[PDB]
Symmetry: C3
Subunit: 259 residues, 3 copies
């Protein structure tokens, strides 16, 4: 999709691409290591067995959808390795996963909500997947649109995120009472991350360089690196622990849910 | 994928991009509203229950593949909102869903046939990929400036002609299964399918990339109407056919003619 | 994604794009015909029935995942028809499936391993799919990166292919003892192709024009056309014959596996 490139003399001074690229690349490398290691741990723990007792699977293999968390974390870590490669090369690299904002997210966070929908047995998994997909593509369109119509694209995304986030919460609540108090605690701390960090992205858009102009692109990159460390890595860890508690309750102890 | 952009002085006069952009944007906005509302109604009606009696689902939720029609209509409505944004900005916008013809279709109409294959229990749900490939052969045909675009078009005609011939046959095998009311709804859906899908290849020949009889603006209006028919009306007809099928088999418990 | 195009006077002499385009287009057309015909035969044979006896399916239709081999071969044949169109037009065509190396592969070979995972009942089908996906995208990034960081991208791909290829082999071995000796023979000849031709691509990268500079882009195109004739077409034929023998053993004769 690329047309632009870093000028031979470098990015013009004062432009949004005139960033601290060694620092951004170091942050991206650290994020890559952390998120990829978290995904590797999730896959290894999933292969260990069901619950904290590590009860062997009857088929000898874990459910395929249960690998979604670790797969998403490993894909995010690989894209952050690519981001570190792009930043350490000075930015504007032909294969830049940093250039088009939220283009990487159209790969992780839809699958992520799918994983969430598979972990909580949430209804309308395809509906939630496509809502997140369209919201992220509206964000990509807003960040590639140089006119005021980007605020239209943003609004379009806000027309896809506000219902979804309102629906998901409701559905999440319907599942929350089902689970035992310990799984409820893990789910509570995962939903705190979800419903307190997903709304941050729309707010960050308004104060970014494409909005009120209060947040620079470098600060945007650092903020979104921390958000991906939270929304992918920490949220996936919390989902893995919630799954372990649910399996210990229902598969190891055989106890029924509060449904 | 974009390399081109609207020139600072505007699109050159007499070029294919020198179109009535306020009119195209208004048409795209109306299409967005209509198709998105149709998808919202499809999802709401699906959540209402099975059949016309709105029989509650045993699990409390509808089948996931049954949301395909409304999801496709909502995705098409969102892409038409993006198209209206592009047209109202004068065209040639970096995120232009109007520039690359049939690029948007690679997202809807494959899923659409999937929905169709899921609604009629059609074999080789193959079909999807065939449509996929066909549409990509269209995309290339509209980005190739040489005569080899007619090769790409022909390649698509080598993927659409068998598929459309196979689908019909398979559709016929399912048509006798369904009751006469579901048969009526299926008949009116298949009329749209087999009478409007062939239009796109014919429209290619007489477009600016063929005989030069249809301008790009007329192409946009024609395809807006076609998307209003192939996505919106066809999805409505499929929803009504599903409602009749559920009323026959799930509410009344009657068996199919299989 | 295209920015470049063939210059009005043609590709500069001595450049990597200054290739024998009629020859490349003829090779691509022959490959298209062969691979598309192999996919058509695979789908027709699948529709014939189970096993060598062509036992009719109970539902009257074959399993959907069993069409993966023929679908992949037909998609590869269509992409090779597009490649022949691009080459016969002189290269650098806006819809060039030859320009971005391994970009076409991100469409076939993941599905291919999925097909493999479905044919051998291999665990972690999604994990293998995403590993191949990420390896191929790392290859695409390496072949679009003009700096030394391409060797980083390559290494990233080598960090995704080496574990996967090591895991797959192990899992394949666990399945190999299950199957009867005839299915074992067909599986052996398919795994020979897999584990002896998939490692070739990383080695070909090193000696290509983006590495040591020993293999030209034209030679790369011919080599990869032959590899796609082997990895898609011949491997799909071997998988179809293995499936036919397995169905003759288990569905026609009703005999159990060595599990
Ligand atoms: C790990 C990454 C995550 C969880 C990304 C989440 C993204 C969103 C909640 C998207 C937000 C936006 C929309 C509401 C539309 C306007 C633009 C965005 C992308 C900032
Ligand atoms: C709502 C949109 C629909 C139903 C689109 C349908 C598209 C086709 C039937 C595709 C037609 C073409 C081919 C046969 C190949 C040549 C190029 C196309 C895209 C016009
Ligand atoms: C029919 C095509 C096939 C089987 C393609 C296979 C591709 C690979 C085994 C990929 C190899 C590479 C990686 C290990 C990363 C570095 C770059 C590649 C793409 C050469
Ligand atoms: K995760
Ligand atoms: K996991
Ligand atoms: K990322
Ligand atoms: K990007
Ligand atoms: K940028
Ligand atoms: K970005
Ligand atoms: K799960
Ligand atoms: K997760
Ligand atoms: K629809
Ligand atoms: K629907
Ligand atoms: K559309
Ligand atoms: K487009
Ligand atoms: K155009
Ligand atoms: K278009
Ligand atoms: K359906
Ligand atoms: K539909
Ligand atoms: K194959
Ligand atoms: K096949
Ligand atoms: K190919
Ligand atoms: K390409
Ligand atoms: K090239
Ligand atoms: K290539
Ligand atoms: K299979
Ligand atoms: K195969």
């Amino acid at each position: 999709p690329f047309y632009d490139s870093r000028p031979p003399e470098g990015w013009p001074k004062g432009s949004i691409n005139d960033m601290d690229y060694p620092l951004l690349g170091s942050i991206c490398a650290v994020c890559c290591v952390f998120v990829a290691g978290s995904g590797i741990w999730m896959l290894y723990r999933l292969d260990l067995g069901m619950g904290y007792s590590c009860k062997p699977y009857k088929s000898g293999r874990a459910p395929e959808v249960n690998s979604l968390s670790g797969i998403i974390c490993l894909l995010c870590g690989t894209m952050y390795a690519a981001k570190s490669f792009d930043f350490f090369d000075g930015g504007g690299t032909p294969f830049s996963l940093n250039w088009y904002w939220y283009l990487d997210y159209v790969f992780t966070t839809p699958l992520l909500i799918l994983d969430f929908a598979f972990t909580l047995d949430l209804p309308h998994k395809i509906r939630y997947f496509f809502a997140v997909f369209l919201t992220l593509w509206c964000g990509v369109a807003a960040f590639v649109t140089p006119s005021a119509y980007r605020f239209a694209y943003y609004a379009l995304g806000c027309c896809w995120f506000t219902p979804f986030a309102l629906s998901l919460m409701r559905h999440v609540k319907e599942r929350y009472l089902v689970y035992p108090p310990k799984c409820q605690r893990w789910l509570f701390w995962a939903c705190v991350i979800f419903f307190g960090f997903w709304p941050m992205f729309p707010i960050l858009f308004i104060f970014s360089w494409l909005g009120t102009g209060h947040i620079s692109q470098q600060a945007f990159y650092i903020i979104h690196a921390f958000l991906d460390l939270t929304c992918k890595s920490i949220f996936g860890i919390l989902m893995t622990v919630f799954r372990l508690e649910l399996e210990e309750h229902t598969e190891v102890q055989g106890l029924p849910l509060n449904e």
